[PDB]
Point group: C2
Chain length 124, copies 2
């Protein structure tokens, strides 16, 4: 059961970095998207194109996955994406990520019916 | 059990134009700090000053809380804070907030032992 003091810190404190800079994107998103629970997911990519555009990748260029599986696809064009990589400083439960925005091609694994993206494999 | 497609969207999709825009702060923080679970917390303020500085308020100016309780204190100095308000468009499970940065004195209820902030009452 959360103490009132802890609750206040959770709901009202953010000195770990003011509401300033886009350098904080990853720290906030990785937390919002639940990838800092029990462990700091070391690396993650966020795509900003439409869901439709990313889904459309399942029907674009075929490429093998890094794990040998053969259900990977590469986007025909670059996409605006955001790279999140835990920083040396970061140490769970104090996850720190470096935000790096680039427009690259993405490789994803597709599955299910209809076949949609189910795994981000890499950006190229 | 979250579907593979659902998980991909959670872990990798953030469609939009101003991804890391400060105008997105509240949407990301309100989500990260869990104030969008079950429903959208209508209003919330995040203080960007030092935890030590905010706790210090508890030994500053005594004031009566907005709800009539008598354990509120107001900061002597203004503090950098971000105001978060749910937008007319926002409606669970699709919470949306307007981010507003300003500098004001904060009023918080203090309790427990040691006496520390346990509730954000108001800013002014």
């Amino acid at each position: 059961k959360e103490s009132a003091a802890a609750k206040f810190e959770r709901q009202h404190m953010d000195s770990g970095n003011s509401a300033s800079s886009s350098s904080n994107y990853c720290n906030q998103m990785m937390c919002c998207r639940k990838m800092t629970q029990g462990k700091c997911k070391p690396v993650n990519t966020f795509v900003h194109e439409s869901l439709a555009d990313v889904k459309a990748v399942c029907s674009q260029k075929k490429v093998t996955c890094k794990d040998g599986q053969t259900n990977c696809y590469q986007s025909k064009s670059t996409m605006r994406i955001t790279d999140c990589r835990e920083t040396g400083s970061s140490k769970y439960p104090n996850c720190a990520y470096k935000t790096t925005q680039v427009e690259k091609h993405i490789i994803v694994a597709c599955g299910g019916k209809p076949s949609v993206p189910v795994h981000f494999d890499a950006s190229v």
